[PDB]
Structure formats: structure tokens, C-alpha cells
Amino acid sequence: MRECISIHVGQAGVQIGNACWELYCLEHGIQPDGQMPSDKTIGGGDDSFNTFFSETGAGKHVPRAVFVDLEPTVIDEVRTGTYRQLFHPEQLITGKEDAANNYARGHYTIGKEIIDLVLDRIRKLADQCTGLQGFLVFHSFGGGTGSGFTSLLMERLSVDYGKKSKLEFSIYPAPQVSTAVVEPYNSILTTHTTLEHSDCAFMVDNEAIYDICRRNLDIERPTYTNLNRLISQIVSSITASLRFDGALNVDLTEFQTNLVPYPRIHFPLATYAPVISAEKAYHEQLSVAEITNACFEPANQMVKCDPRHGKYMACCLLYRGDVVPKDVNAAIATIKTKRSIQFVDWCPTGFKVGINYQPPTVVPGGDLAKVQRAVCMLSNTTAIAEAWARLDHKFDLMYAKRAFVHWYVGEGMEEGEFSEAREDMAALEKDYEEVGVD
Amino acid sequence: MREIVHIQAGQCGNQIGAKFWEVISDEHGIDPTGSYHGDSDLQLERINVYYNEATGNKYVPRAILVDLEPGTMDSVRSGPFGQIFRPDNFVFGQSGAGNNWAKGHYTEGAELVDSVLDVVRKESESCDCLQGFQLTHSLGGGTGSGMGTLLISKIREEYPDRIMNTFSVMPSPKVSDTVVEPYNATLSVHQLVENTDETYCIDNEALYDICFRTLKLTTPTYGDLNHLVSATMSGVTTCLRFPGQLNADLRKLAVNMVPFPRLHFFMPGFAPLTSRQQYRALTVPELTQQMFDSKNMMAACDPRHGRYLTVAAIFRGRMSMKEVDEQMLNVQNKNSSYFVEWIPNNVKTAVCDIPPRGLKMSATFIGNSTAIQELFKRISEQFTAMFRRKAFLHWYTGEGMDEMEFTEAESNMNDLVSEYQQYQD
Amino acid sequence: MEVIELNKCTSGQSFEVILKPPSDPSLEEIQKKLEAAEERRKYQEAELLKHLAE
Amino acid sequence: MYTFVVRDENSSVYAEVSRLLLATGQWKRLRKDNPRFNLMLGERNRLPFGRLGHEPGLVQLVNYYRGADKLCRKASLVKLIKTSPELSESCTWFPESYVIYPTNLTDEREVFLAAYNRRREGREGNVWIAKSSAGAGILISSEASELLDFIDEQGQVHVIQKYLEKPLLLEPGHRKFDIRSWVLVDHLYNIYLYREGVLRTSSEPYNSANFQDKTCHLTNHCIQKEYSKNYGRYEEGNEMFFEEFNQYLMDALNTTLENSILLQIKHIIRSCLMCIEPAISTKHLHYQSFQLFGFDFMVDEELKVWLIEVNGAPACAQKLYAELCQGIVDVAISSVFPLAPTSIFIKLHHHH
């Protein structure tokens, strides 16, 4: 067994981390007080769930997580929330004033005076790991902390933990649920300094999570709780292989081996289905073919884009519930003959499939209904580059006039770091086009 | 615990600030004695942003009252909520400023400034984490203008990394105490362009016309103009006083509203504005159509004459947040020719459930429009109409100033206009 | 339509299907970047105070 | 008040639609870089589809189907026919075509020579035509050596397809011609055929013993108006419309345009568009698409219709600008952004 340490940076990271660990505990039968009646090894054991949870002599199962936020209002929710008993104070780090949506402020000004503290707290969680695999970093692109402090934390993690893998769960900025105009700057600043330090990054466009909540859950105006409860389902499906007995994606290294043949192009697109409303009278349960077929509909993708006009480099299918290999192959045969699935000629045209028989756990009283089977597809498509083009374009609109640039220079950044970061994106868009278009 | 320190200077500054604390104190359930008697927890959630908590559960406004004559502040203390202000926080002189900037900035004011900063330093030392300062004052007088800016110049020196916010009443000849108001305003505007992160421009003419034409007040008073500023001030600060994620603290609001350091002068706006047909429920489309109408704006600048750099709206009350988005997105998609296209998503919207006193719902408007240059163009044209003959300069030269310092303020604001002009094309 | 590497356990199983074959900065340098920005701030604040002294 | 932008100043078609939209007083035009729009009349090449459908509260619509180039490119159309089972290689209404890459750069060189040597050995007509998209540049020759040597002298992809040595000739004149049909596809993927087509005829008699002079073989409106000496003789602008052409088919051949040709054209359009529907449809897309196509057909002396090419950015016959443009607003734009007949199209029902 090998341990995985989770790191949540900024409000978005912290709140999403709350929704996940709430979900992990329901899935592994862990109670709010950290007790686990099913764990027969008291105070120890190297089971698959131990990759995310340590154990105390008293029988408590404590997440391997650290929460970092430059302002204490969001992390105070954790210290007094339902799962306060899970964490101990060392795990929750909070400043006194945030980064004001300014990457420079999170990375340089504030980040310099607190970076050495985070590493120490993380070092304390590493000292409990007999064979640490790496880290999962949750954060946002727009937030000053999620963008600015994360990129720094990643630069140092690659120095203190050289051989360890690092995966991101990044939140893509979406105006429908954002009040910050400079989030393009931050996103493009953080992607530049974080690129050579992250091995695999699952971007989630809030715009996508938003419309899925309005369309499938009939939420007229979804709250962050709604978006997070859904995002924690996707995250749960992606981390399940690490927390449950299995042979596919059993360690963080396998994520890069299976999904990222080229280093810079490490942004798999995630698709999830079905998303069914709990308030519904009673839904006709979908078959294996119907839910797999939905994985190629743009409405169910974590980032809105058209994979039909890209090329696949890899592709995984993670099933949970009543699914047997026989049914998986049948649906795939029928989808190839109907869909436009073009692979790059230097990669095989195949699917790695993993199945966990335990169906998805739904948060009691949440928005999602209990289904008997569900799937999550991770496909590395050049079509996700559409997201970068959108973002880079907005960056050019504001930067052409240097709007808001004085706020970054004022915290110590150089104006040259903008264009330097932008040129790195222009190269990232070029690598995508070199791989996909003819 | 993100506390704000309040300063109000001069006659206008203190009469507006007074009514301001009357309005929000009511919203937070604070009676004139400092005791809380509300019925909701949202009132106290962010209460310590503007109030200090004393013994016996008493709430004391974190406000400093400043003036060079006792008259105005003696009325505040005997006024409605006068007993709530900290006694020590009354710092005042006896000479007066005679509506002279030079007196408030160099002579009389300079004799009293160190003692005001002694109180500011005392309120700050008690803040767990100080956000920044907000000053209420007029620019056409002598104290709020001359000493007000002198205070900002010194607060920035002692607190260089805190946000400096001001509510500045701009002078207009149609609502005038003295002919020298353009002189005092031109001199202050330069200080603000240098040492303020955010200045809410409030033209007394715009306030006058709104009372005369829209509110059907046959003979407005300064009190009537101050009712608007009270409501407006209560509005723009809603983001700060209640649980909200949008424009939460002062620095985050600046990072989203000021794309250039010197263009930080906003046009505020309120809605509804109803004359006494006052009980009619106001719909969300009505709130939005009026909120953007120039007649509801308090800068006296026609927005359709310039372009919007950024916009922040705030809707208060129990309403359909879905219907708010539909209508906001409607106004943008119906007049996209007045919003700059090189700043994506430069129109944000925040919802609050607690409506102001007496209204089911309302909307407050905060605009960073280039049309504000019309305000500084009026002030400059009036400044030059007199300075070209050196009229009334003797009031200032007698206090130590030189004609050169006037020529500089002149060129400094003409620059400010030229700056707002290149971004309108 | 081939199925390879079928692994089965109590909690599920995983396999692979093939349809068609194919055809950093050191700690010293990060502290410098950080201190370099902390220096550009100190200089700008000095010019502000120098300006305020004048 | 719907808003739209214009990113193709050279489009004679949508230039009129823009004039009509503003004439309704309910559509407002914005600068070509304002993202807050309902409708985009986008550029031809590198149209930024990836930035569409990401504006909260705006339903956005564009006039180009992303991926339709697969049908409007010479080499792309040929590759689509030979690979798509819906069309198969044995497709009967598409000339035997081959994709040939110049030797300075898959490639069907040897496959073309095989069928070429089988025809040369069977005494059959062996006249082929070479062409490409990068043309105004065409060569008609019966010798394979000339066709190949011609492509190598260039530097872009070309296509060699069987030349229709037995084309239908109009009388009087003994002249060649082609038929243009405008087809519109709305966001719902309804296939509407414009009831009005045009015959771009050749004003020079057809001569089968001299492919060197390409004035009587090529029916392009620009070639006839520059190198032809009988331009505008038999009809105005070498453009005969469906009414006169239908009267001719009845007086000379004793048949109707509907029965002899229009049935085949309607079959071809359906099979081409239905094939690529699962690749370009915007049914569940965050934005909506609709596009106007221009099909070019050939007619042999047996009254069989052959598909020449498909145009993605077609122009219209001068006389038909008003009727067709207004129709575009009715079925493609107003259907999504309604305003506050006897349809001029012919819907081609199909299975989605």
C-alpha cells in the first residue's frame, strides 16, 4: 500500500475538498467522528482505503489532507462543520487577509511568508507515509490564492518531493458564477508556472457544472454546494481506483502512463453520466450502452468542447455498480460505428476499462438520485484546447491595453512575466494543433 | 475580522456621515444607545466591519468625527444617534476653515492633524486585521476638502498598504455656498487622483435635480440631498456589511473596478426613487431599467456620452436571482455599445436578502464610466473662468500658497480629463 | 475487437480493449525570484514615501 | 433586440442578409470583435468555433457547420465518398475519382494508373480531368503522362476524375453546361432545397477532339465571360433558369426537369448531407449551426446526374439574391430568433 496526500488551496479548493471527504467517508463507511466499524484492524492496516486515511490508536480514520487558505472564513466552516472531528488543527492553515484575486499577491507577497509553514505541515503528513505516492492538489484558476499560492506550492513540492507525482483538480473560470474580472490573468499565470510541475490535471469548467445542474437537476440558480456535490462525484470516480481493490489506475503513476503520452498535454477531459434529479418521481434506469453512449455528448463533459473535431490520445472508462465486461464491449462496438472517434496515428485505438461493483454513493438529502450503474470517461482530446483558446483570447483583450496590470506589478511581479506566461500558452495551443489537426 | 475605519470631515462630511450611521445602524439593529435589538443573525455576522464591541454587548461605530469649528459636530452629538459615537473620537478646532482649502490643508488643519491621527492610530491598533479607511467629505469647502485630503495624505504615509476609500460630494454652482468651490474641488481632486483607491463622485447638482424633478420636492434642503447619500452609502457598502462573496473586501473590489490606478472615480446610483404611488411593488425589470437610467445616477454625467470600464450592481431583498440574471444580461445585450469590449465580463451582480428600511427590494449601482470626465470638465472650466483673472486668489495666497500651485492643479486635472478621453475611443 | 489483461477481484474487475493498432528550479533560485519581487516592492514603497516626504 | 456581427466582408450573400436584418429594425449590428452577439456571419477560414456558445444568457448561432470542409474540398469530398459506407466506393452518381499528391511531398497514384491501363486496354474512352481547390488551373488530357507531369509542376494536392466525355448538349448551340443548386440546412438539420437553380452554360459548341482549348469544356461563369466569344448569345449571362430549361426538356426530350434530373439531385443532396450529419450536427451543442451550400452537377446524354463538387461559401445568381436571402432569414435565423408562402424551399425529409 502507498499513501496519497491531498492539498486544498483557496476557497474553491477548500470547499470542494469538503464535499469530497464527506463523500469518501460515506463510501468507506466512515462516520463523522472518524470511526469505521468495518475496519477490523484497529489502529493500523495497509488496506486500499488507507491510501487516503491514516488510523489512530483509538480507531479514528483521519484524512491525509491539508487545507490552506489565506483568509480564515472558508476554513472555519471546516473547524465547525459536520466533519470537524475528522481533521486536527495542524491540518487546517489559514491566514488573516486573502490575495484579493491577485495571482502576484498569492504567489509572491503573501505566499513567501507562509510557504515554509505549509511545507512543514505537509512534511508532518509525509512522515506518516511508509511509501508516499504523491499529491492531489485542488484549487481554482481565478482565485488569488488558488492560482498564485498553488503555483508556488507546486514549485516547492517538486523540490522537496522530487520523485513524487502531482495531480491537479483545477476549476476553470466561468462568469456565471464569478465576480472577478482578472481571472483570465490568474489562470494563464498559474498554468505557466505550474505546467512543468503537474503530471496530470483535470480541468472542470464551472460553466459546465453550472448548466448540468440547471439542465439535469432543475436547479434554477445552482449554489456552490450544488456545484461541489456534483464535482465531488466526478472526483470520487477518479480517485476510486486508489481507494478500492483493483488493477487499473492503482497508483498515481498509472494516471500519467495511461492518459498522458506527451508531457505538456496532460489535461484529460472528463465526462460523467448519468446525472439524475433526486426530486424526480422515478427515473427509468439506464443501461450500460446508454450511459456509455452519453460519454460522447457535449452536455455531460466537465469542459464544453467538441471532441469530434479533435484526436484522442488515450481513453479510460471507469464504471461503478451493476456492470460486467460483456456489456461494456457491446456498447463500445455500437458507438464506434455511430460516433466520430479519431485517434492519433501514433497511439492505439483502444479503451482501458475499470469496474467497481459498488454503485455511486449519494450524499443523503443531496441533489443526485441513486443509480444502479454509472460511468466516468477520461479522454485526452485535442478538443480541450478550445478551452485554452477562449481563455487566452480574453487575456489578449485586457493585456492589449495593460488593464489591471498595475495591480500585479504593485505586488512585486514584472510586467514581462505576463507575456512570458502568454507565450507559453501560445506554445501550448500549438502543441495541441500539431497533434490533432491535419 | 476585516475592520474598516471611518473618517468624516467638515460640515458636509459630518452631516452625511451622521445620517449614514443612522441608516446602517438601523439595518444592523443598533439603537441610538448602541444596543442590538434585531431579529436576524445576518445583522451581526459582519457587524464588526464598521462597529467595535464594547462591554455589555454594546456596539460602538468605528468612526472618527473631524472639523475645525464646533458647530456641526455639536449638532451630531445632540442629534438622533449622536450618543452612539465614541466621545473621544470627536476631534475639532475652533477657528474654522472659512471655505478655504489652504486653511484646511496648510494652516488651521495642519495644527489639528496630528491629534486626529492619534485617534486613527488608536482605532487601528485594535483591529484584528484592518481593511482600510473610508472618508466622507465635500470638495468645495475648506475642512472636508483641505484637511480631508491632508488626512488622506498622512494616512497613506502611515498605512501605505491599506485601501483608502472616500465619498466625495462634488460642488456645483446651482447648489453653492461660495464662489470658491471650484478652487477647493480642483485642489482636492489632485490629492484623490494620487492617494485614493476609490472615490464615489456625488455631484450636488445631480442630487438637487433628483430631488426637484424625480422626487417632486418643491424646495430641496441639504437634508434632502443627504437622504440620498445615506441610502446610496448604505447601498454600495452592502457587499461589506453582510454575508456575500462578490466584492467582499475593499481590496478585492478595487482589483475588479480599477483597471488603471488614476481612473478610480465612480458614479453611484440608487433605485427605486419614488415620490409620495409609493407602495407599489417594484418589479425586477423596473429596478434594472431605473438603476441604469442617468436620472437615477448621482454624478450628473450622462453615461451615453462615455463608455463603462467596469460595473458593479447589488440587488437587495427577497427576489428571483434567476430573474435578476435574465434582466442584467438583458441590459448588457441591449446597449453593448456603451461597454468597452476589451474587458470581458465587466458587469458583475450581487444579491442580498436584507432590503433597506421601507422597501421590499432595491438596487444600487456602481459605475466606473469614462463619462465622469464631464464632471472634471465642469470643475476645470469654472476653475479657469476665475483663475485667468486671479479672482479670489488672495484668500489662498494669504495662507502661504503660490499661484504656481494653482497652475499645477489646473494642468493635473486637465491631464486626468485627457486620460479619460483616450479610453473612450 | 480484442480483450486483454482481464483482472478480477472481489470489488470489481478491469481490462483493456483494442479496436485498431497504431500507425526544474532549485530552492536557491525560487528564493531569489521571491526576494527579487520583495525587493521591487520595497523600492516602489520607498519612492512613495520619498514622494510623501517631499 | 437581437444582435449580430459580420466577419466576412467579401460575402455577397450575407451582405444582403445583413441589409435585410437591419431593415427589420429588430436586429442590431456590432463591431466584428464584440463577443456579445446572437448571430455570427463568420469568416471562411479558421472560423473560431471554439469561442462560440460561452456567453451567459445568449443563444448564439453561426452560419457555418464546423467540419463541413470534409464535403467542400476536392480531395476531402473524394476521400469521404470512398471511405464512408453510406456512399461506398461503388457510388454510382460520383465520377471515378482519385487523390494524387505531387511527388515533391494516402496517395492513389498507382491505383489511378491501374484503372487507367484497364480502360486504355478496353478501347474505352480514357479522358481524365485534373483539378484542385487552389485554382481560380485545370488540365484536360487523355494521356496519363500529361496529367501526372502537370501535378508535379505544382505544390498542392490535386484530384484526377473521369471526364464526362458524353455530356448533355443544349440546342441550338451544341454546348456544355452545369447545374447549380442552393441547399440550406438549419440548426435542426432540416435539408431545404431552393426551388430555383441555375444552369451556367457554355456559349461555345462542345468539341471532343481538342481538350487544349478549355472554353467549351469549362462552364465557369468567369471563364465564359473572359475567354468565350459567344458570351450572352443564347441566354443572358450564360444563365438559364429552371423555367426555360424545363420547357426545353419537354419540347426536345419529352420529359420534365423534376422527373429526369431533379429527382436525382434531391437524392444526391440527401445522401451527402445525411452521411456527415453525426459529425457536424449541432443538436446537443452549446451553440447552433446552419449553412448554405452550393452543389454543382453534370448531366450526360443518358440523363444521368453526376456530382462535380460542393461549394461551402457559394455566391448566388444575380436575379435570385432577394428571394433566396429572405428565405434564409425565414427558415434559418427567425426560426431561432423569431420576430415580433408557399415556402420557397423543398424540404428533404430524412431519418436523423
Ligand SMILES: Nc1nc2c(ncn2[C@@H]2O[C@H](COP(=O)(O)OP(=O)(O)OP(=O)(O)O)[C@@H](O)[C@H]2O)c(=O)[nH]1
Ligand atoms: N466549483 C466551485 N468553484 C468555486 C468555489 N468557490 C470559488 N469558486 C470559483 O473560484 C473562482 C475564484 O477563486 P477563489 O477560490 O474564490 O479564490 P481564492 O482561492 O480563495 O483566493 P483569494 O483571491 O485569496 O480569495 C471563481 O471563478 C469561482 O467560481 C466552489 O466552492 N466551487
Ligand SMILES: Nc1ncnc2c1ncn2[C@@H]1O[C@H](COP(=O)(O)OP(=O)(O)CP(=O)(O)O)[C@@H](O)[C@H]1O
Ligand atoms: N469529371 C468531369 N467531367 C466533365 N466536366 C467536368 C468534370 N469536372 C469538372 N468539369 C467541368 O469543370 C467545371 C467545374 O470545375 P470545378 O468545380 O472542379 O472547379 P471550381 O470549383 O473552381 C468551379 P465552381 O466552384 O464555381 O463550381 C464545370 O463547368 C464542368 O463543366
Ligand SMILES: Nc1nc2c(ncn2[C@@H]2O[C@H](COP(=O)(O)OP(=O)(O)O)[C@@H](O)[C@H]2O)c(=O)[nH]1
Ligand atoms: N449633500 C450635501 N452637501 C453639502 C452639505 N453641506 C455642505 N455641502 C456642500 O459642501 C460644500 C461646502 O463644504 P463644507 O462642508 O461647508 O466645507 P467645510 O465644512 O469647511 O469642510 C458646498 O459645495 C455645499 O454644497 C450637506 O449637508 N449635504
Ligand SMILES: COc1ccc(Cl)cc1C(=O)NCC(C)C
Ligand atoms: C445654499 O443653500 C442650499 C443649497 C442647497 C440646498 Cl438643496 C438647499 C440650500 C438651502 O436650504 N438654503 C437655504 C438658505 C439659502 C436660506
Ligand SMILES: [Ca+2]
Ligand atoms: Ca486498518
Ligand SMILES: [Ca+2]
Ligand atoms: Ca516534477
Ligand SMILES: [Ca+2]
Ligand atoms: Ca492658531
Ligand SMILES: [Mg+2]
Ligand atoms: Mg478567498
Ligand SMILES: [Mg+2]
Ligand atoms: Mg459650511
Ligand SMILES: [Mg+2]
Ligand atoms: Mg469552387
